[PDB]
Amino acid sequence: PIVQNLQGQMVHQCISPRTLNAWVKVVEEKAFSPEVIPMFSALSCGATPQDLNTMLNTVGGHQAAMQMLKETINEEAAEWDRLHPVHIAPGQMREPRGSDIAGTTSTLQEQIGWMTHNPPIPVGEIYKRWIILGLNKIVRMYSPTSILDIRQGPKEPFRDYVDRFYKTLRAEQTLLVQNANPDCKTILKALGPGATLEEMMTACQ
Amino acid sequence: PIVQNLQGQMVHQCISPRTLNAWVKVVEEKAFSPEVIPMFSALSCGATPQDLNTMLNTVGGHQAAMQMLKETINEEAAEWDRLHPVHIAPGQMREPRGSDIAGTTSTLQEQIGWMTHNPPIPVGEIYKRWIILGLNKIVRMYSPTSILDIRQGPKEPFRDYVDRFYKTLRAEQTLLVQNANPDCKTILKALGPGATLEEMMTACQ
Amino acid sequence: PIVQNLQGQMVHQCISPRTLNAWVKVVEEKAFSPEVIPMFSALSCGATPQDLNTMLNTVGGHQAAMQMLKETINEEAAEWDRLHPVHIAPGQMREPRGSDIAGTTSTLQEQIGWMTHNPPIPVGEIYKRWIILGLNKIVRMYSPTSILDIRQGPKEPFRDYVDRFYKTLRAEQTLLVQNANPDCKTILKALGPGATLEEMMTACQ
Amino acid sequence: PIVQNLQGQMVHQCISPRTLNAWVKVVEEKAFSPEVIPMFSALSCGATPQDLNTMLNTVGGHQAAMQMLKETINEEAAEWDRLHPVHIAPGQMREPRGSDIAGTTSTLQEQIGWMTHNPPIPVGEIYKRWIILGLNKIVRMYSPTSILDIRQGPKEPFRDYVDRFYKTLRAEQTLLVQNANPDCKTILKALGPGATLEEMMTACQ
Amino acid sequence: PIVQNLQGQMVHQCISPRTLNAWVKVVEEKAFSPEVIPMFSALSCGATPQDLNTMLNTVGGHQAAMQMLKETINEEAAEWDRLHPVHIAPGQMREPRGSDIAGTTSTLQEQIGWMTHNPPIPVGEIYKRWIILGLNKIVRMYSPTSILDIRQGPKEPFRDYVDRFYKTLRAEQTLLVQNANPDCKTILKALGPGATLEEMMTACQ
Amino acid sequence: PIVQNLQGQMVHQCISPRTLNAWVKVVEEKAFSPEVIPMFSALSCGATPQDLNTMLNTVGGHQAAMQMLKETINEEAAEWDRLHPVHIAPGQMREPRGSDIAGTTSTLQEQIGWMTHNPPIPVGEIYKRWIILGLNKIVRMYSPTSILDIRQGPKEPFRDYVDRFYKTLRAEQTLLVQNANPDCKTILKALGPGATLEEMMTACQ
């Protein structure tokens, strides 16, 4: 990534083997569960476009997924050119294209240039925004079942049902009461309006 | 987080993959056991609001819990605005809202600004206070059984009973004697008043 | 590798035991699966030719593979000499041969010289390009089956078929529709032209 | 803790996730075996009172134990006040109470102040002394059996008996000969006085 | 080892517990497989003779091996004296003997002196050359079977045979065709001369 | 330990949790196998007497052993006083006793003083010498069987016998031929005198 030294200067640093290992393992073990996204964002703190491609290209499985991502990334590159066309001067910075932000037509040297520029063109963050929009589309896609089929088991503790409800709800981005079992529906109906989730859960314990 | 370099200056540092891994694993293995809280507080030393959201958003399970937390965080944002309303000047700091402290309406850039300000507005610590108040409410909620149902087994060693008693007592935040078995109740009654826990446990060995 | 200190200077650093361990483990567990290549490239960031030989020479198995690599590396050394022949001056830099870039006839001292030169002769990157061209030839070679034999199981979920299709396709570097089962072929044929992979997969869910 | 930078200054540093993990694991696996204490002391090198509370508060089990510790810590706070009563001046240091050394009534800011003072008030070491005196009381308490019941098995190798003897002896803080079996008692009696443990063990091999 | 600080100076650094652990584990798990040597060389980057003895002396098994190594090291010490005899001056450097390079008759202080000298006497690299020549002799010795007994199974895939061939060949430091099975011998004979290993393997797939 | 910063100065550093973990694990898994000693020496590089006590006091088992060590350490303290008696001056260094080198009667402050003195009194190395002499006595003691009972199995490969021979020989600190089986004795007798171990082992393969 790009990080601050101890003497203030912004400088390139090899992506750590820890960071490389963590991303591949998280993908192995959680596929496209929604919590995976903030894990990506954190593990890619200060990342060059080169670093971002490395993290995506190290995934062995989920290639239907990594192909939809390319589709999404390209749609975002086109839109970028549409908004910032381009026409260089010896030892002068060249403006970036869509394909330059997504690191396919740019060098690490240019990427370090733009991101450390004063003022900086933050190509790492622009690309990451594109990637995250794409990973979100995939998460919604790979949610195994709909919020409509999340109903509480007649013998299912309220808390464990809420957990299923808001798990599903997060993947897809008073239905809680509707889908509740009759025993707990009864108590919730009685609580009146403007009940907090804490109160709802207390009540049904 | 924000940490001191070696040359004195306060500067931003990527949250470590070790720290990211430790929090998710602790939540996996201890759920909302009370000891989890000081583990959160320590693992989030020097954390920006961005860092705090990352640690919460990396949890995959316990979404009933992470939803009550939002409820608690929002109640605290409202109370913040109630106490510090707001109305910016070119390249000048803008005062923070409730949603700015909780990192939903603020940039990492602004967060670094406030926290490194001279004097600093410590938005990281203010947010963490909010989160911890919320995690406490959850711990009390998820205590499996009441201190009233903690009674010593007729064949249960005193020490292992005390451990159950003060485990329960910590989750909920001479009852010890009341709930003791008759053999050990007898000895404790005899010890008279102002007996230390050490003496109580010695006596019953 | 060669890395920047904290005071700006470009300086040699022992290859870390973490990096040494990661490469050998990745080769143990993924053989010449295509995702292995970007893992090599990342783990060898800033690498001297000496460092590159170390990473290759630490592999115990796959010696048919590591022999084809030598064949490829030598073909690239010849081509290098063909393009940059050579004829030294006391305490002056000597131009590098093919065998010098591939680190067989050069010292670590000379390698540090060329790579830190102003302007630098980047022998590490030139060699890595050679190695990667060679590892690619091997990946294609060790793809277990052809894209032609990737057809969807009559009871195989579309998503899991796409994953097999683009796994195979990556190793080898509307056939998707051709190879689809009849139920899903039907729906895809109906979608008309210019359908995105996301739409294709949605449709077949 | 408080540690020296590279430029000499004494400065605060987040407690490492390694250190956090090591203490909790050691307690999991060795309970209050006597060797645990020097492990605590080492893992808490340079620790603020805040750091010390964090290490204690991260333990989930052994709450009878962690309650006796509070009892011991409070007895030591009282004794501290008894010896150093207190009565502040704008931007001037306030003398610490018992509860300030044990980090319950003090800020991290004040703790950093006292410990980096010239001359320093070493509140970290004063607290640690209190804690260690308390953990010792617990170790003695949780020694499973008395030195009197450590006798050598008629078919038990001398060395393995000595190990049991000095294990027990350390937990509790020519009895060796008394408790020896008759075969080895015989040889030891014969060795005369002023025999080294090495000679004793040699003799009985 | 000896490493560069951040301020340029060459300075001594404790051998890391990671490096200590890695060498012992590699020896545990691969014995004197040829790939072990480049692993030694890399793990001992910048090593003092003291560091080299530490790495050898931490091996518990393979003592027939570690004794042949001493034999080889001593033969190299004699040859060193034969080539550089010796006859010191207050606070002046004394020339090194064979036993000084191999770290048996020298202090760490002297080793740091020679290796940081301007110009440096690189006793670490001279010793490592000796050790590696010795470890090579051992690898050849502990090759389980001869290249002559590497023949392709009638039902053995060509690739897996090449792997056995070049594994054996590396330990010992158109025989491929000779030893091939008749089906694959046939195709290889037909390929004519100057066939690349890639072509040979393609052909036999 | 005491280590060099990046700015040259010799300064105290907390013993790492890695180093703490490595020593305890090595003792768990190898007891007093001779290879354990160089592991101790390396893991305790730059160690204060305080650091040395920490490493010994973290061992839970082997207390017969750790008691003989105290016996040995005390014998060495007496001998030290015998050789360097003592009689302090305000803010002036006090000469060390036997008990000061072994860190029982000295502060970490004094230990840092002596070891960083110009010229330094190296109390860490003096103590470590004492400890190592003691651990050696223990290794010899805990060698399970004598070199006299190491004889080659009639069906035991020569190499595996040499390994047993020199394992035993190292613990205790042409007998090889004597103890050889008759088949291999025969060949060795025939080799004549001045045969290298390599030749001996070659011959018997």
**Quick one: closest CA in A to C195, which residue?**
A71
What technique determined this structure? X-ray
Single out the residue of B133, B36, B122 nearest to residue B79, CA to CA. B133
Among A4, A45, A46, select the one facing B11 at the smallest CB separation.
A4
Distance (Å, whole) CA E160 – CA E163: 5
- How close are the terminal C-alpha atoms of chain F, in Å? 49
Hey, is A10 helix, strand or coil?
strand
> What are phi and psi for residue A203, nearest 5 degrees?
-55, -35
- What tokens appear for D88 in the block? 């502040």
* CA distance to partner chain F, nearest, from residue D87 (Å): 32
Alpha carbon E54 to chain centroid distance? 16
Render the burial of F9-23: b for 16+ CB within 10 Å, e for the rest.
eebbbbbbbebbbbb
Chain D interface test: which of F67, F68, F74, F143 (most D C-beta within 10 Å): F67
Distance from the F73 Cα atom to the nearest Cα atom in chain D, whole angstroms: 13
- Number of alpha carbons in the 13 Å side-chain half-sphere of residue E18: 9
The alpha-carbon radius of gyration of chain E (Å, integer) is 23
Q: CA E66, E70, E76: angle at the middle one, nearest 5?
A: 140
Angle between the F123-142 and F36-43 helix axes, to the nearest 10 degrees? 160
Tell me C48's DSSP state.
-
Provide the number of CB pairs (under 8 Å) joining chain B to chain D. 80
The radius of gyration of chain F's CA atoms, rounded to the nearest angstrom, is 23
Q: Answer whether E42 sits within 8 Å of C20, measured CB to CB.
A: yes
Could you give the CA distance from residue C147 to residue A186 in angstroms, rounded to a whole number? 58
Does this chain's domain B2-142 share its CATH topology with B147-204?
no
Q: Respond yes or no on whether the N-terminal peptide bond of residue A119 is cis (omega within 30° of 0).
A: yes
Q: Tokens standing for B41? A: 């507080």
The residue of D67, D72, D137 whose CB has the most chain B CBs within 10 angstroms, and thus the best one to mutate to test that interface, is D67
List of chain D residues whose C-beta atoms are within 8 Å of the C-beta of residue B201: 64, 68, 141
A189-198 b/e (C-beta count within 10 Å ≥ 16 → b): eeeeeebebb
CB half-sphere exposure, C48, CA atoms < 13 A: 27
How many alpha carbons fall within 13 Å on the CB side of residue F63?
A: 16
D132-146 core/surface letters (b: 16 or more CB in 10 A; e: else):
bebbebbbebbbeee
Q: D with F: how many residue pairs have Cβ under 8 Å apart?
A: 80
| Six-digit token string for E65 | 């091996």
- Longest Cα–Cα distance of chain E, Å, equals 76
Q: Would you give the DSSP letter of residue F149?
A: G
Which helix (H) or strand (E) element contains residue B50? helix B49-57
Q: Are A49 and A101 in contact (CB under 8 A)?
A: yes
CA angle, E47 as apex, E45 and E50 as ends, to 5°? 160
User: Helix D63-83 vs helix B158-172: angle between axes, to the nearest 10 degrees?
Assistant: 80
The one-letter amino acid at C202: T
Question: How many Å separate Cα F165 from the centre of its chain?
Answer: 21
In whole angstroms, give the CA distance from residue C183 to residue E149.
55
DSSP A117-132: SSS---HHHHHHHHHH
Q: Which of E13, E17, E142 sits opposite F18 (nearest CB)?
A: E17
**Distance from C-alpha of F26 to C-alpha of E5, rounded to nearest angstrom:** 30
Nearest in space to B63 (alpha carbons), one of F5, A172, C143, E23:
A172
Q: Do B7 and D12 touch (CB under 8 A)?
A: no
Contact A63 C7 (CB under 8 A): no
CATH architecture under which domain B2-142 falls: Orthogonal Bundle (1.10)
Q: Do the beta carbons of residue B200 and residue B192 sit within 8 Å?
A: no
Q: Is E52 exposed, middle or buried (0-12, 13-18, 19+ CB in 10 A)?
A: buried
Which residues does a chain break follow in chain A (C to N more than 2.5 Å)?
A: 87, 173
Residue of D nearest to F58 (CA): D35
Q: Hey, where are the domains in chain C?
A: 2-142, 147-204
Distance set, CA D116 to CA D106, D122, D124, F3, F111 (Å): 15, 8, 11, 21, 20
What three-state secondary structure class fits C10? strand
F94 annotated binding-site participant: no
Of F45, F169, F198, which has the smallest distance from its Cβ to E14's Cβ? F45
d(CA C117, CA B41): 48
Per CB-CB distance under 8 Å, the chain D contacts of B35 are 57-60
Alpha-carbon distance values, D57 to B52, D60, D69, D104 (Å): 20, 8, 11, 12
Residue E81 in 3-state DSSP? helix
Residues sharing a CB contact under 8 Å with residue C26, sequence separation 6 or more, in sequence order? C36, C39, C40, C43
Contact E7, B7 (CB under 8 A): no
User: Which chains does E contact via 3+ CB–CB distances below 8 A?
Assistant: C, F
Choose the mutation target among C57, C135, C139, C142 for the interface with E, i.e. most E CBs under 10 Å.
Answer: C57
Q: Test D67 with B166 for CB contact under 8 angstroms.
A: yes
* Tokens of residue B167, six digits: 């485990």
CA pair distance E126, E109, nearest whole angstrom: 17
Distances A145 to A151, A163, A171, C4, D14 between C-alpha atoms, Å: 12, 14, 10, 50, 42
Chains that touch D (3 or more CB pairs under 8 A): B, F
DSSP E161-179: HHHHHHHHHHHH--HHHHH
CB contact under 8 A, F159 and E62: no
Q: What token pair was written down for A134?
A: 């794409």
CA-based nearest residue in chain E for residue F170: E63
Contact B68 A197 (CB under 8 A): yes
If one counts every other C-beta atom within 10 angstroms of the C-beta of residue F126, the result is 17
Angstrom distance (rounded) from CA F143 to CA F171: 6
Contact of A151 with A179, CB cutoff 8 Å = yes
Determine the angle formed by the axes of helices F17-30 and D17-30, rounding to 10 degrees: 30
Separation CA E126–CA E139 (nearest Å): 20
Maximum C-alpha span of chain A: 76
**After which residues does chain C break, using C–N > 2.5 Å?**
87, 173
Report which of E56, E129, E133, E126 is spatially closest to residue E97, judged by C-alpha positions.
E126
CB E147 within 8 A of CB E172: yes
Closest CA to A57 of A104, A13, A126, A117: A104
Report the alpha-carbon angle F86-F88-F94, nearest 5. Answer: 55
Enter the tokens of residue A80. 């970028």
Resolution stated for this PDB structure, in Å: 2.7
For residue A95, how many other CB atoms are within 10 A of its CB?
12
Rounded CA separation F46/F43 (Å): 9
Chain A residues with CB under 8 Å of B18 CB are 18
CA-based nearest residue to B56, from F172, E93, A38: A38
Judging contacts by C-beta atoms under 8 Å, the chain B residues touching residue D61 are 163, 167
Please report the beta strands in chain A, taking only residues with DSSP state E, as ranges in sequence order: 2-4, 10-12
What are the phi and psi torsion angles at A53 (to 5°)?
-60, -45
- The architecture of the domain spanning D147-204 is Orthogonal Bundle (1.10)
Cβ of E60 and F33 within 8 Å?
yes
User: Which chains neighbour C (Cβ–Cβ under 8 Å, 3 or more pairs)?
Assistant: A, E
